[PDB]
Amino acid sequence: AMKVIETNFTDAKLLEPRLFGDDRGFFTESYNKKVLETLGVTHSFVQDNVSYSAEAGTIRGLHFQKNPKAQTKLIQVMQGAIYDVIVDLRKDSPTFKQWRGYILSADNHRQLLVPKGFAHGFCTLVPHTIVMYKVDEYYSADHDSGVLWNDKELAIPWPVTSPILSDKDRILPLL
Amino acid sequence: AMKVIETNFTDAKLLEPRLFGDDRGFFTESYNKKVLETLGVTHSFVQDNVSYSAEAGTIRGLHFQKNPKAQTKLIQVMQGAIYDVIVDLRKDSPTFKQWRGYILSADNHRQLLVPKGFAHGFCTLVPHTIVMYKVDEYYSADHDSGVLWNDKELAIPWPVTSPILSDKDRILPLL
């Protein structure tokens, strides 16, 4: 079934689904609610989002929806590959302000469980990258916030010098 | 938000989500539980399946899981394109044994809600097609059944003369 590759910051989980291949292609259960609960991931997802980025080096984030509408996310890459970063913003947390960069791709089929209290963003590594992610709380343009990609406090080693960013993404606040 | 393009057999719906496109690519809510409810679609999906077919002309199906463990399927195409066919197998229906073929692609983003009581299958149209589908009941081996892709009564004008099938799909029982 689906298995845990690593756990970081207590609750963040890098996961891998069991693939079943043939000469014809493959099959996989990319999500199984009851399986996830066994792996200590109990969430009822309400929305699935799909992000398409035409050019490599496109940066999406760092996003976080402020409470009372915080979102648990579960991200995967359907086409292409991305360098995904998560930052622990729980002030109480022993791992507060810490981050981690993961490579999620169409070939590795890896998924990342981003808990509530974290900032999340990614950098596409090749053209035509498609990212899909579930959220357990509906979107709220009101509570939609984030952290500027190049915040010097975090000093994230993005694999791009001049990222393709939306104007909205270039004016996100610092940490 | 999401729009119902057409409805057939009383309950099967061809859906299309809202797509926010800009200079960098696009973003869309492929699944939204609340939105679907407002359209008349209410189900608790517990499993997401992914199917990758290397070559064009690969037929997967026709398939249904036996009652009482029938499954509602929400079909979507993440890469490539398919000719998706559903067949009404509800003995107590005014459309029993009728079928419809739909074209779902990564470029149209259309989705198909296949009710419990229908057989479902598809033929990939281009190489490397990826199909994702959500189900409201888990996979149950003992309840696995289907209809022969080239069954004589079903008219199904598949767009492939010699398709690629698994050994078990060639074995599937006739209606």
Ligand SMILES: Cc1cn([C@H]2C[C@H](O)[C@@H](COP(=O)(O)OP(=O)(O)O)O2)c(=O)[nH]c1=O
């Ligand atoms: C339909 C389904 C299949 N599977 C497994 C059972 C099979 O061993 C494998 C492939 O499914 P299937 O398409 O039935 O096999 P074939 O390729 O021979 O037609 O996937 C699941 O784990 N979950 C599911 O929901």
